[PDB]
Amino acid sequence: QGAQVDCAEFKDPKVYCTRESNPHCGSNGETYGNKCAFCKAVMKSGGKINLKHRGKC
Incomplete structure (x- = not known):
């Protein structure tokens, strides 16, 4: 395993x-x-913006 959503x-x-x-949607x-x-964005997000990137949020 290992979620590969590094950027x-x-x-x-x-x-x-x-x-x-990729139309991906944030937390x-x-x-x-x-x-x-x-x-x-996520970088300067705050530290509480995870992802549910599939299609809409």
Whole structure:
């Protein structure tokens, strides 16, 4: 096992942004999905934004 939803190791170089490759939906906070959007937000989320990323939140 091991949930592979890490987003630090796939930052660079010029990888995850703009053209969203997955409408993924946050805990109970937001609908987004471009790898950058999610890692970027979640980073500065607060520490209470888990994920229920499938389709809608």
